[PDB]
Design a protein around this ligand. Sequence first.
Ligand SMILES: Nc1ncnc2c1ncn2[C@@H]1O[C@H](COP(=O)(O)OP(=O)(O)O)[C@@H](O)[C@H]1O
Length: 175
Amino acid sequence: PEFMLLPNILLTGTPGVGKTTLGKELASKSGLKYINVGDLAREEQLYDGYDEEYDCPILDEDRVVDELDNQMREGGVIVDYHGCDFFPERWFHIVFVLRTDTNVLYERLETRGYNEKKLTDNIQCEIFQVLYEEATASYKEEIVHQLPSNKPEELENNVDQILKWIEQWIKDHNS
Ligand SMILES: Nc1ncnc2c1ncn2[C@@H]1O[C@H](COP(=O)(O)OP(=O)(O)O)[C@@H](O)[C@H]1O
């Protein structure tokens, strides 16, 4: 991949929709680097404060941006997070909001062992389309796309679609 301009891709959407599954498959099949923002914050200890209601450390957004910026500038990164308003807009060439039917999503999150309050907050996040609205508010409409993420066939279609998009973008930006 030396001396090829490569795109950056954001995968966002409610926890449980399938971002990590899709991102890891995309990385394996494209050679792009996959970054799980939650995992990165854990590894590099990028937290500031604790949230009383949700019972979780608060992500230090400025430090996450600082941690990633050099790599993002170099391109070829697939970023996975359930938030997107704090990323520099320039980072991403395309943004995918994964969507899961509420009934399907509930079953996924219930199996994670989420308690009632956490289940309800996450499920309302999806049914209010919070991440979709956050994405459209943060990035140009023409680069934001919703992807269905309910069934294995849809995962396969998503992988296929995005891999094809990567190939075209590379062709267009390495004349
Ligand atoms: N398109 C899909 N069809 C069926 N199951 C899926 C799909 N995408 C993800 N899953 C499953 O749903 C669960 C949550 O996926 P995960 O990638 O951890 O979501 P996220 O990273 O958005 O929190 C996992 O058990 C995964 O195997």
